[PDB]
């Protein structure tokens, strides 16, 4: 069910934050463990700051706090060109629980197509159900990061899922969830955007974790 894939997405669901070395930590949205060390995240939370490698980058797992030099994570694309959300290798977190196989084949993306979703993400590590209205495919979809000096960027990723809905800061990251049951309520991909009640999520596939 929708619940029972939501529970596994929710006990994956880390807090990803950014500091300098003996500073305090900026917590910035959400990252989602995969299998072994290996978590999604998007790439937007950190790589568009100043010396980003000499940052610590911090994860909060339930209150229990880990920490590496950001120059020690290792980070892997989904595919070629910018697609925002990464594979990112972190030795210092433990091990995850592999949901690899709950995320949807990329034979089976039209299958979540026209159908409601749900966002399962946080604000800050409360776990929170945001329903999406009937999902399309942009095969390009482009949205407006704010950085912290105030200036934006402008992000284009390639096959985004958009679905009516009300996002709040902090909710990226979170897991996108098919309300197919025939697919198994398939993990669809991250959420990278929210805005003018629209919700907008990187098309993550089983296939792309080939990339290690
Ligand atoms: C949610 C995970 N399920 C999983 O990996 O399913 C793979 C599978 C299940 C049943 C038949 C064939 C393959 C889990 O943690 O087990």
């Given at each position: 069910?929708?619940?029972?894939?939501a529970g596994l997405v929710?006990?994956?669901?880390?807090?990803?934050?950014?500091?300098?070395?003996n500073?305090?930590?900026?917590?910035?949205?959400?990252?989602?463990?995969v299998?072994?060390?290996?978590?999604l995240?998007?790439?937007?939370?950190?790589?568009?700051?100043?010396?980003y490698?000499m940052?610590?980058?911090?994860?909060?797992?339930?209150?229990?706090?880990y920490?590496?030099?950001?120059?020690?994570?290792?980070?892997?694309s989904?595919?070629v060109?910018?697609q925002?959300?990464?594979?990112?290798?972190?030795p210092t977190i433990?091990?995850f629980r592999?949901?690899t196989?709950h995320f949807?084949?990329?034979?089976?993306?039209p299958?979540?197509?026209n159908?409601?979703?749900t966002?399962?993400?946080?604000?800050?590590?409360?776990?929170?159900?945001?329903?999406?209205?009937?999902?399309?495919?942009?095969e390009?979809?482009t949205?407006?990061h704010?950085?912290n000096?105030?200036?934006?960027?402008?992000?284009?990723?390639?096959?985004?899922?958009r679905?009516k809905?009300?996002?709040?800061?902090?909710?990226?990251?979170?897991?996108?969830?098919?309300?197919?049951?025939?697919?198994?309520?398939?993990?669809?991909?991250?959420h990278?955007?929210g805005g003018?009640?629209?919700?907008?999520a990187?098309?993550?596939?089983?296939?792309?974790?080939?990339?290690?």
């Open positions: 069910s929708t619940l029972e894939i929710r006990k994956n669901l880390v807090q990803f934050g950014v500091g300098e070395k500073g305090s930590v900026r917590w910035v949205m959400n990252a989602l463990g299998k072994d060390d290996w978590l995240v998007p790439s937007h939370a950190y790589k568009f700051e100043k010396d490698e940052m610590e980058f911090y994860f909060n797992r339930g209150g229990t706090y920490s590496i030099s950001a120059g020690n994570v290792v980070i892997q989904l595919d060109g910018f925002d959300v990464v594979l990112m290798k972190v433990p091990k592999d949901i196989q949807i084949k990329k034979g089976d993306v299958r979540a197509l159908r409601l979703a966002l399962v993400t946080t604000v800050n590590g409360t776990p929170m159900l945001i329903s999406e209205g009937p999902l399309k495919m942009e390009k979809a949205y407006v704010k950085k000096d105030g200036t934006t960027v402008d992000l284009t990723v390639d096959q985004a899922w679905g809905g009300e996002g709040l800061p902090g909710m990226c990251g979170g897991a996108l969830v098919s309300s197919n049951q025939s697919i198994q309520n398939a993990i669809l991909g991250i990278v955007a003018n009640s629209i919700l907008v990187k098309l993550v596939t089983q296939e792309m974790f080939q990339n290690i």
